[PDB]
Amino acid sequence: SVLTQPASVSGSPGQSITISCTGASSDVGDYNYVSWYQQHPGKAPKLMIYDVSNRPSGVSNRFSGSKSGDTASLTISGLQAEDEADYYCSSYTRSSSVVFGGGTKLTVLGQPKAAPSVTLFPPSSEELQANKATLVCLISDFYPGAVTVAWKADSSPVKAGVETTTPSKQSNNKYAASSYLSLTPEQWKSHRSYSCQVTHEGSTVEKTVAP
């Protein structure tokens, strides 16, 4: 048995939002051991709803649960900025003894945009003496954390030797990411220049280095 969950839901502050588990309701005379969890990045999940309409002590009454047919729903009223986290549903069945849903990433909208600050470094002389070359493209202070990177050498796109990280939230609620281009010292000084283009929300910022 599988519990399906929307991959992403988004709302504004003050808005109400409903996530929906659409899995286990089965086995007619059996009961419903359905529960919900909230998980902030780098922390353990927190039980928000169990037993489907019940809520444990300390959890804000803005969270409530319901179920109709084979679909359970978690309703969050008066969306606050701290509610932005990942949400999971769970259920106990005779067949399978718990199933955590795929998860739903809740985004609280309204926050201002931010273009990425990009810094590009050429390979060091000390690295070229070791017969290696690596281009370092560093992406900082962009909001939200969605971005894609394309490398080029004299207007020609290059795919070989590109290692790009996933975005990560900084301490200032903005995101960061880095991309690395590996080259032999021949490919570096034979070409005219190298560029790292960072496209963010349709706006592309570019930086270029050359030997």
Partner 1 sequence: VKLAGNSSLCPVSGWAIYSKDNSVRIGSKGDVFVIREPFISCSPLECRTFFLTQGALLNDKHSNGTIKDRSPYRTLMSCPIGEVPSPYNSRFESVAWSASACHDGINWLTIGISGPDSGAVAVLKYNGIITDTIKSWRNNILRTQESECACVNGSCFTIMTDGPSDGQASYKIFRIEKGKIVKSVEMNAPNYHYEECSCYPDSSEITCVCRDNWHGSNRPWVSFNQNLEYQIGYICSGVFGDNPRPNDKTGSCGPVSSNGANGVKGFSFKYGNGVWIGRTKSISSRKGFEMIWDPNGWTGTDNKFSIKQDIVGINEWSGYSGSFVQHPELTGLDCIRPCFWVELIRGRPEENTIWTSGSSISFCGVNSDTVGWSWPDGAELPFTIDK
Which residues of this protein are in contact with partner 1, per CB under 8 A?
27, 29-31, 94
Distance CA 82, CA 117 (A): 26
Residue-level length of the chain: 211
Report the nearest approach of partner 1 to the CB of residue 100 (Å). 21
Nearest approach, Cβ of 89 to partner 1 (angstroms)? 21
* Cβ proximity to partner 1, 67 vs 152, nearer residue: 67
Rounded alpha-carbon distances, angstroms, from residue 7 to 26, 45, 102, 167, 178: 23, 17, 8, 18, 25
Residue 19: which region, alpha, beta or left (left: phi > 0; alpha: psi -120 to 50)? beta
Cβ of residue 93: shortest distance to partner 1, in angstroms?
11
| Alpha helices in the chain, H assignment, sequence order | 125-129, 185-190
- For partner 1, the closer of residues 27 and 82 by Cβ is 27
CB of 27 to partner 1, least distance (A): 7
Q: Is 3 left (phi over 0), alpha (psi -120 to 50) or beta?
A: beta
Minimal distance, residue 84 CB to partner 1, in Å: 37
**21 to each of 3, 56, 59, how far by Cα in Å?**
6, 19, 20
